[PDB]
Design a protein around this ligand. Structure first.
Ligand SMILES: CC(C)CC(=O)N[C@@H](CCSC[C@H]1O[C@@H](n2cnc3c(N)ncnc32)[C@H](O)[C@@H]1O)C(=O)O
Ligand SMILES: Nc1ncnc2[nH]cnc12
Ligand SMILES: [Cl-]
Length: 213
């Protein structure tokens, strides 16, 4: 029934309502609830430097209601990891590759927490990337993500030493995108497909090669 929709430059004309709704939800959740004060904005929309033409949004929709989601951004452009937290990836280095995208802003609305949605969101990043031929995703993440990644069968490679970021233990890591990981998650969520891709076909790797130039 309810699906996670892939929204990008090529199809956002079908999702302008939904995108605006999600920017406001990001403000409610990341700013008001989690207190990431650096992201507070007076328009009540949580929008940063990595919300632009090249961003891909994976949003869980029930009708036109956003109930969860996350976003992906190219590592071939300046990214949050490369610009804000490069020291967190000092051991292995900060990724820069059309085949590696930075994963961020993972959220679930209160009404849908501790239910089926969470594992669907985990399957969604694997499904989208595999479809696009994206090999890995990178993230700056709170260290409590490690057991969550492991529970979902994600293959994780730490990029540097954990460090305190605004009173919270944080780290940089890559996740290997795997057909094997996805197949198990499809079995667990009881659905052969969780990502809906309406409108024109997105070629993410081509777009990342372009903005790399
Ligand atoms: C996808 C999931 C596994 C990991 C995840 O959701 N990762 C999150 C970041 C987890 S770390 C939380 C800290 O990052 C700061 N932060 C977030 N965006 C920023 C920005 N644009 N500039 C400066 N600081 C920023 C914010 O103020 C917190 O202190 C994300 O990338 O959206
Ligand atoms: N902010 C948080 N800290 C620790 N565990 C969590 N599980 C979900 N959110 C969390
Ligand atoms: Cl804007």
């Amino acid at each position: 029934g309810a699906m996670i929709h892939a929204i990008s430059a090529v199809n956002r004309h079908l999702y302008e309502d939904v995108l605006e709704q999600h920017f406001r939800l990001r403000h409610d959740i990341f700013v008001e609830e989690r207190h990431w004060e650096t992201l507070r904005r007076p328009d009540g929309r949580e929008v940063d430097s990595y919300d632009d033409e090249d961003t891909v949004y994976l949003l869980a929709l029930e009708g036109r209601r956003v109930v969860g989601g996350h976003r992906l951004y190219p590592t071939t452009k300046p990214s949050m990891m490369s610009e804000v937290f490069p020291h967190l990836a000092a051991v292995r280095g900060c990724p820069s590759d059309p085949l590696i995208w930075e994963w961020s802003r993972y959220f679930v609305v209160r009404d849908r927490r501790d239910g089926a949605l969470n594992l669907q969101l985990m399957a969604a990043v694997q499904e989208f990337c595999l479809d696009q031929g994206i090999a890995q995703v990178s993230a700056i993440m709170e260290t409590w993500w490690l057991p969550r990644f492991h529970e979902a069968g994600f293959v994780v490679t730490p990029l540097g030493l954990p460090a305190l970021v605004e009173n919270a233990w944080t780290m940089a890591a890559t996740v290997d995108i795997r057909r094997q990981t996805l197949d198990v998650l499809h079995d667990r969520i009881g659905m052969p497909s969780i990502v809906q891709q309406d409108g024109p076909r997105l070629d993410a790797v081509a777009r990342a090669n372009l903005c790399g130039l």
